[PDB]
Design an enzyme around this catalytic site. Structure first.
Site, PDB file in Angstrom:
ATOM      1  N   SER A 128       0.826  -1.196   0.000  1.00 49.41           N
ATOM      2  CA  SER A 128       0.000   0.000   0.000  1.00 49.41           C
ATOM      3  C   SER A 128       0.868   1.256   0.000  1.00 49.41           C
ATOM      4  O   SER A 128       2.069   1.219   0.281  1.00 49.41           O
ATOM      5  CB  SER A 128      -0.932   0.008   1.210  1.00 49.41           C
ATOM      6  OG  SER A 128      -1.755   1.162   1.212  1.00 49.41           O
TER       7      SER A 128
ATOM      8  N   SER B 261       1.428   3.622   2.006  1.00 50.28           N
ATOM      9  CA  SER B 261       1.533   4.143   3.362  1.00 50.28           C
ATOM     10  C   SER B 261       2.971   4.224   3.846  1.00 50.28           C
ATOM     11  O   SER B 261       3.416   5.295   4.275  1.00 50.28           O
ATOM     12  CB  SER B 261       0.707   3.280   4.322  1.00 50.28           C
ATOM     13  OG  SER B 261      -0.677   3.536   4.169  1.00 50.28           O
TER      14      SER B 261
ATOM     15  N   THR C 166      -5.123  -1.366  -3.038  1.00 51.55           N
ATOM     16  CA  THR C 166      -5.240  -2.498  -2.117  1.00 51.55           C
ATOM     17  C   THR C 166      -6.320  -3.430  -2.656  1.00 51.55           C
ATOM     18  O   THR C 166      -7.494  -3.296  -2.305  1.00 51.55           O
ATOM     19  CB  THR C 166      -5.566  -2.032  -0.699  1.00 51.55           C
ATOM     20  OG1 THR C 166      -6.824  -1.348  -0.696  1.00 51.55           O
ATOM     21  CG2 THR C 166      -4.483  -1.101  -0.168  1.00 51.55           C
TER      22      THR C 166
ATOM     23  N   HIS D 109      25.066   7.539  48.169  1.00 49.76           N
ATOM     24  CA  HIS D 109      24.620   8.379  49.274  1.00 49.76           C
ATOM     25  C   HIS D 109      23.622   7.673  50.182  1.00 49.76           C
ATOM     26  O   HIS D 109      23.329   8.188  51.266  1.00 49.76           O
ATOM     27  CB  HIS D 109      24.017   9.680  48.741  1.00 49.76           C
ATOM     28  CG  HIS D 109      22.541   9.612  48.496  1.00 49.76           C
ATOM     29  ND1 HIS D 109      22.003   9.136  47.320  1.00 49.76           N
ATOM     30  CD2 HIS D 109      21.492   9.973  49.273  1.00 49.76           C
ATOM     31  CE1 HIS D 109      20.685   9.199  47.386  1.00 49.76           C
ATOM     32  NE2 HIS D 109      20.349   9.703  48.559  1.00 49.76           N
TER      33      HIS D 109
ATOM     34  N   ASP E  44      28.385   9.629  42.817  1.00 48.86           N
ATOM     35  CA  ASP E  44      27.608   9.014  43.894  1.00 48.86           C
ATOM     36  C   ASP E  44      27.069   7.660  43.425  1.00 48.86           C
ATOM     37  O   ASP E  44      25.876   7.467  43.184  1.00 48.86           O
ATOM     38  CB  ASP E  44      26.485   9.948  44.327  1.00 48.86           C
ATOM     39  CG  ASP E  44      25.712   9.424  45.519  1.00 48.86           C
ATOM     40  OD1 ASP E  44      26.348   8.915  46.464  1.00 48.86           O
ATOM     41  OD2 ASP E  44      24.467   9.519  45.511  1.00 48.86           O
TER      42      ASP E  44
ATOM     43  N   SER F 213      14.300   7.241  45.615  1.00 48.07           N
ATOM     44  CA  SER F 213      15.586   7.717  45.127  1.00 48.07           C
ATOM     45  C   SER F 213      16.581   6.566  45.000  1.00 48.07           C
ATOM     46  O   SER F 213      16.511   5.569  45.722  1.00 48.07           O
ATOM     47  CB  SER F 213      16.148   8.789  46.060  1.00 48.07           C
ATOM     48  OG  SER F 213      17.275   9.427  45.484  1.00 48.07           O
TER      49      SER F 213
END
Ligand SMILES: *[C@@H]1O[C@H](CO)[C@@H](O[C@@H]2O[C@H](CO)[C@@H](O[C@@H]3O[C@H](CO)[C@@H](O)[C@H](O)[C@@H]3O)[C@H](O)[C@H]2NC(C)=O)[C@H](O)[C@H]1NC(C)=O
Ligand SMILES: *[C@@H]1O[C@H](CO)[C@@H](O)[C@H](O)[C@H]1NC(C)=O
Ligand SMILES: *[C@@H]1O[C@H](CO)[C@@H](O)[C@H](O)[C@H]1NC(C)=O
Ligand SMILES: *[C@@H]1O[C@H](CO)[C@@H](O)[C@H](O)[C@H]1NC(C)=O
Lengths: 200, 706, 215, 43, 89
Positions: free
Chosen positions: B228, B230, B298, B471, B520, B643
């Site tokens: 098609s 598309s 199509t 930490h 960290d 965290s």
């Protein structure tokens, strides 16, 4: 008795009168009324078992140009593009049947179609003047895929709200300056969908 | 192209795709475009009209908040609570009346996909030949008779389309003929994981899995594609890979099938027929699969008529193996706007040739299977459903958001049979638990004398090392003061050592900055080895051989190329795992690696201890990544207990971590359920700045480091 | 104690019922029960056998009414498994109906009737919506006599009245009642009762509520 | 007008066919039970 | 199905949609009953307005007027009848 009006209303609906005895309501007789209708009965077209009423518009508008045809013919809901010539009309009260002969089909439909087999079409009485159909003339049309109605192979394409039918002038009328542009656009559009067709 | 004025979307973004031939609307989670997604620039100079379900006029295009289908009815019971509309993550409790037994999920919450979690809740009395088929949400059932030969009808409400069986008839076996219906919308897409699960369940038989056949019999596959107008770009880029992977995978079940290839743009083309001698060899069929080219419309009826011609024979008497062969049709249509009729009649012809739709004593329904995959937002679900097959407890109709999911499904199917060694493998089990969706997450608890216990999380990257923030821990902490939990298991694992960056220090005290987060990161080395389980499973690392094979690239690809691919100079999609009420979920977050980075780094001035910093650039090192906020999209913030989690970018159904959460701008996370500042951003520590340290410390884990 | 959720049903619905199995102390007990659903003709269409062990006396059962079924008085007969003669009954309607929108009651000022009334018999109409409001409409009132296994109607006493704000005032005169029958003596009416049949139609002509104060 | 406004659909003739257990400790032989139910759309 | 004396006098109903010949096998010792009935719709559609003869007319006059003519179909007149008339818009 006299019944008055106060405001103009478009597409009024029919009223009904029901008469019954005070003890039983199921043994009542309901009868409708309407100034421009038969027994206040909404226009529906039936073959003894199955109906789909056509209280809608025969067409939309007729103006339409090559771009208009391009936009309104590549719709997702269109199924067939057929040119026909009017041969026989069976005028009646409930409806009218138009029987055609097929020259060649631009687009194929889900129904078996070939050059030669007869096809029938049905429209409500309200189209008896809007479309001003005449015999021995050619036409081209496309419509909604919900047209199928009947039993194979004697199906019909109902000219409903979404059905678009346009005048296809013959060779003699195509020479008229008024319809020369329409004929040329019709031919170009025909060859366009024959060779390339609608996108997607 | 057409005029670009007055085509944008309010509350969203619009871009020109296919060189101005189309425009696509997108918003983040909780919002989908309304009432359409794409418009086509026709030849009239203007785009396609805004078409609703009733084809009404639309004042403006906006992307509306995600709501959830209301129960059109729940017979013989009640649902709690009842609302005119249901929001995201809203929960319903389905309760039965007395004498009616429940089957399905009672507590149901519907996620951003738009469907309720779990099986449909049914209350049944069990006094008939067959049972209640259920009344799905949004679909309403007509017919309370459940005897034999009785049929029920299902249909959807306004704005919903029916996918399943329009009418289900009770079979003489005790079942219903067809699939369970559902109410679908335009924005709804099926995730690749469940698509692969349903494809495996329908195609195979669980034990592992296998594709059995009739003894002394073979099977035939008909792979059909659409040319098609598309996408049709660069010789089916990705589709060829999908089909090659499928062909390789099916042959790994111990059976040698036969293949056939159909492609059509204006007329069907035959590439492989079932009558060829070498149709049972994977190498040649793949080679021909790589030889597909373009040469419009199509015309599906003509193509499947060609397939019909392939199936049909020219002999008078039926040939041998006519009732001992199984046929599979796979169709990858992106369009299917009919041109030349409907393909229903030819399916009827196909099943009449095989004697399927003629008797009920020997239905033989399992000898033909049609699978249709939907691509793009321009799909018509009812046409696809009427074109495909329907058998109970099985899904033959699928739908994906983008072409990427099309090969995601098949790469997942390939990876399913792989050994559990490689990272990124997550199977979407039908009856999975919380950790079945996020198995990489690990929780760490710190117990301190007379001090509140500290809870953090990290990612399991191998059988001996866990990556986390630094930490969350101090050098004062002893070996006995750290506990690790994985997969919601009470049993703990002893720790051996925690490794910190040599330049890392949680103590710039004289610079007026109270807190600093340079390098960290923490590497926890486990005492023992980890046994791979259903909810314990490792994750990949950047610039590794596992990452190289995960992104489906040749091994020669460089680490810098991987960084560019996963982290381009634009917005980057990702998500982070959050914990709320002993349950785990995913929150989508976006990384700003382009023009928005420099502004985003400024938002850290709102963080505590950063108001008096003279040089705003000093506190924000290039190793940090700034995410969250409302620009360019609304992103939730990380919670106080959330965290240190791993930031992961998903690609090709693979999870690859790109960093570790470090801190945030403000602590306004708890307002999510209850008001968030527009400057609320989350800062995380990148992994690409510690590559030599990762290589040095994790050189004995056999991770294929580059 | 068989209790159903309703009294009247439609073809295509579900009968829901609870059997409360008590003992002679009105206390829950655990037994085995046999349940039959009988058609209006008198032959069961379904039978079942349940147990009440650790169920606290509540036995919830259900039944599906076919869409192609016979109308009338359907029966549920439940008895203990040990006692086939201990039949307990529950009769419910199956009919093709629709919900009325108001209740009409016809009440007499004097709840009895006296032979020698020189004024007549006064009955008043209280037509109120099921949510307790007042109506505006008209009503038709007729009378009759409740003899032995029969009903005699009096077309002369066929009156029509305006229901003025949920109220009516109908007076049946003695002459009409006397002319209804052909008995020279009124004292022969002792031992028989009258019935009043009223039917109230709304000003919209929508609903149809026929109420009877028989006896 | 009539697009963003919901309607009334659930019109049953018998609902609330439920069971409930009184387990709160007695207060002079009376147990209080506070339960949320949703009345039907019917008027 | 099995028929026992204790469980007899029960309506065992088997439902069928297709019109085809049936074959029953009655074995064992005793007696029994069998009835096969097809419930359907027949095209014997007569007129229903049995007890009335309502007829209507609309006639513009020199604000159109409506006329209704009614009749009771029987050997005796009718009691108070109710006539509902629905006007147009
Ligand atoms: C389900 O979600 C909706 C929408 O998210 C919630 O509605 C809340 O109140 C209004 C009513 O639609 C929402 O709209 C917005 O409210 C502002 C006032 O802040 C007003 O100017 C506009 O009407 C605007 O459209 C509002 O977004 C939403 N509240 C929040 C905090 O988002 C609804 O409460 C949710 N729950 C239920 C049970 O419906
Ligand atoms: C459903 O959830 C509620 C609260 O969310 C809970 O009280 C109830 O026990 C749950 N029902 C189950 C788990 O069956
Ligand atoms: C697609 O294939 C054709 C022939 O198979 C080839 O000519 C063309 O270059 C290909 N397109 C590419 C490689 O982008
Ligand atoms: C297939 O059909 C042939 C035709 O006679 C039959 O002999 C054979 O048994 C069939 N195969 C089956 C039923 O598996």
């Amino acid at each position: 008795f006299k019944v008055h009006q106060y405001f103009n209303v478009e597409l009024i609906q029919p009223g009904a009168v029901k008469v019954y005895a005070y003890y039983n309501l199921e043994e009542s007789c309901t009868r409708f009324y309407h100034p421009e209708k038969e027994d206040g009965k909404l226009n529906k077209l039936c073959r003894d078992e199955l109906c789909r009423c056509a209280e809608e518009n025969c067409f939309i508008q007729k103006k339409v140009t090559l771009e208009e045809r391009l936009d309104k013919a590549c719709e997702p809901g269109v199924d067939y593009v057929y040119k026909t010539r009017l041969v026989k009309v069976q005028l009646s009260n409930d409806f009218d049947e138009y029987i055609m002969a097929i020259e060649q089909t631009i687009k194929s439909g889900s129904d078996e179609v070939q050059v030669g087999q007869q096809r029938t079409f049905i429209s409500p009485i309200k189209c008896r003047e809007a479309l001003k159909l005449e015999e021995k003339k050619h036409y081209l049309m496309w419509g909604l895929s919900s047209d199928f109605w009947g039993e194979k192979p004697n199906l019909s394409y109902i000219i409903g709200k979404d059905t678009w039918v346009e005048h296809w002038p013959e060779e003699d009328e195509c020479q008229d300056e008024e319809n020369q542009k329409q004929c040329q656009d019709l031919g170009a559009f025909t060859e366009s969908m024959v060779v390339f067709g609608c996108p997607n | 192209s057409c005029s670009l004025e007055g085509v944008e979307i309010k509350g969203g973004s619009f871009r020109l795709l296919q060189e101005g031939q189309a425009l696509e609307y997108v918003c983040p989670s909780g919002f989908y475009p309304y009432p359409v997604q794409t418009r086509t620039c026709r030849s009239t100079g203007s785009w396609s009209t805004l078409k609703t379900q009733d084809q009404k006029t639309v004042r403006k295009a906006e992307c509306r908040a995600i709501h959830c289908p209301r129960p059109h009815d729940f017979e013989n019971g009640e649902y709690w609570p009842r609302s005119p509309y249901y929001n995201v993550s809203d929960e319903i409790s389905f309760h039965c009346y007395d004498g009616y037994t429940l089957r399905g999920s009672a507590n149901r919450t519907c996620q951003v996909n738009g469907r309720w979690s779990g099986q449909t809740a049914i209350c049944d009395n069990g006094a008939g030949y067959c049972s209640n088929p259920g009344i799905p949400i949004g679909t309403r059932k007509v017919g309370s008779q459940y005897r034999l030969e009785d049929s029920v009808t299902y249909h959807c409400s306004r704005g919903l389309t029916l996918r399943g069986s329009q009418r289900r008839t009770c079979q003489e076996g005790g079942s219903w003929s067809g699939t369970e219906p559902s109410c679908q919308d335009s924005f709804m897409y099926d995730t690749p994981q469940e698509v692969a699960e349903a494809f495996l369940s329908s195609l195979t038989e669980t034990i592992k899995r296998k594709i059995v056949l009739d003894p002394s019999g073979s099977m035939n596959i008909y792979l059909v594609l659409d040319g098609s107008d598309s996408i049709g770009a660069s010789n089916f880029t990705g589709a060829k890979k999908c089909l090659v992977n499928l062909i390789e995978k099916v042959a790994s079940y111990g059976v040698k099938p036969r293949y056939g290839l159909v492609t059509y743009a204006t007329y069907p083309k035959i590439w492989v027929k079932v009558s060829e001698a070498d149709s049972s060899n994977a190498d040649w069929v793949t080679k021909q699969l790589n030889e597909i080219n373009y040469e419009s419309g199509t015309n599906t009826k003509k193509a499947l008529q060609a397939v019909y011609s392939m199936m049909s024979w020219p002999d008078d008497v039926p040939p041998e193996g006519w009732n001992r062969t199984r046929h599979v049709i796979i169709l990858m249509t992106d369009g299917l706007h009919n041109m030349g009729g409907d393909p229903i009649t030819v399916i009827d012809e196909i099943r009449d040739l095989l004697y399927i739709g003629k008797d009920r004593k020997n239905p033989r329904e399992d000898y033909l299977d049609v699978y249709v995959f939907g691509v793009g937002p321009l799909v018509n679900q009812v046409n696809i459903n009427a074109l495909a097959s329907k058998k109970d407890n099985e899904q033959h109709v699928f739908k994906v958001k983008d072409m990427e999911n099309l090969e995601d499904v098949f790469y997942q199917m390939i990876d399913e049979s792989q050994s559990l060694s490689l990272c990124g493998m997550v199977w979407e089990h039908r009856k999975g638990t919380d950790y079945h969706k996020q198995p990489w997450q690990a929780k760490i608890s710190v117990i301190r004398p007379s001090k509140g216990h500290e809870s953090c999380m990290g990612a399991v990257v191998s059988e001996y090392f866990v990556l986390t923030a630094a930490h969350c821990f101090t050098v004062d902490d002893k070996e006995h003061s750290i506990k690790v939990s994985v997969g919601g298991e009470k049993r703990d694992l002893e720790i051996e050592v925690v490794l910190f960056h040599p330049n890392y220090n949680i103590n710039k005290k004289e610079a007026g900055i109270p807190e600093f987060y340079d390098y960290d990161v923490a590497l926890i080395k486990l005492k023992n080895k980890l046994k791979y389980g259903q909810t314990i499973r490792p994750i990949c690392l950047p610039c590794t051989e596992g990452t190289t094979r995960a992104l489906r690239l040749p091994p020669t690809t460089t680490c810098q190329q991987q960084k560019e691919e996963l982290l381009p100079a634009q917005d980057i999609k990702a998500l982070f795992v959050s914990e709320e009420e002993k349950k785990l979920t995913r929150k989508e977050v976006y990384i700003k690696n382009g023009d928005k980075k420099g502004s985003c780094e400024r938002d850290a001035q709102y963080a505590p201890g950063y108001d008096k910093v003279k040089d705003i650039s000093e506190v924000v090192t290039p190793r940090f990544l700034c995410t969250g906020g409302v620009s360019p999209y609304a992103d939730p913030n990380t919670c106080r207990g959330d965290s240190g989690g791993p930031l992961i970018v998903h690609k090709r159904s693979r999870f690859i971590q790109v960093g570790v959460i470090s801190w945030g701008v403000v602590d306004v996370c708890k307002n999510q359920k209850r008001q968030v500042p527009a400057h609320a951003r989350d800062f995380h520590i990148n992994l690409f700045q510690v590559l030599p340290w990762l290589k040095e410390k994790l050189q004995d884990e056999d991770l294929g480091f580059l | 104690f068989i209790q159903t959720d309703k009294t009247i049903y439609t073809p295509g619905s579900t009968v829901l019922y609870r059997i409360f199995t008590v003992n002679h102390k009105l206390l829950p007990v655990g037994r085995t029960v046999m349940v039959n659903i009988e058609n209006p003709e008198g032959i069961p269409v379904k039978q079942d056998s349940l147990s009440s062990q650790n169920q606290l006396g509540v036995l919830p059962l259900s039944w599906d009414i076919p869409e192609l079924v016979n109308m009338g008085q359907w029966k549920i007969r439940a008895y203990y498994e040990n006692s086939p003669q201990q039949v307990f009954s529950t009769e419910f309607e199956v009919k093709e109906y629709v919900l009325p929108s108001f209740e009409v009651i016809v009440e007499p000022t004097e709840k009895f009737y006296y032979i020698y009334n020189e004024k007549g018999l006064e009955v008043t109409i209280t037509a109120r919506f099921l949510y307790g409001k007042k109506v505006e409409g008209t009503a038709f009132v007729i009378f009759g006599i409740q003899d032995g296994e029969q009903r005699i109607s009096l077309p002369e006493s066929l009156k029509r009245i305006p229901i003025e704000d949920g109220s009516g005032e109908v007076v049946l005169s003695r002459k009409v009642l006397l002319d209804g029958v052909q008995n020279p003596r009124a004292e022969d009416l002792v031992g028989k009762s009258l019935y009043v049949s009223a039917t109230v139609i709304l000003h919209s002509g929508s609903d149809m509520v026929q109420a009877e104060r028989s006896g | 007008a009539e697009e963003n406004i919901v309607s009334r659909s659930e019109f049953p003739e018998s609902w609330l066919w439920n069971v409930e257990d009184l387990k709160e400790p007695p207060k002079n032989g009376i147990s209080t039970k506070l339960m949320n139910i949703f009345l039907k759309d019917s008027i | 199905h099995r028929i026992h004396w204790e469980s007899a006098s029960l309506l065992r109903s088997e439902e069928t949609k297709e019109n085809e010949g049936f074959t029953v096998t009655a074995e064992g010792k005793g007696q029994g009953t069998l009835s096969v009935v097809t419930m359907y719709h027949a095209k014997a559609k007569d007129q229903t307005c049995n007890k009335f003869d309502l007829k209507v007319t609309i006639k513009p006059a020199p604000t159109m007027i409506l006329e209704i003519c009614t009749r009771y179909r029987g050997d005796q007149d009718a009691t108070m009848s109710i006539l509902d008339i629905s006007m147009m818009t």
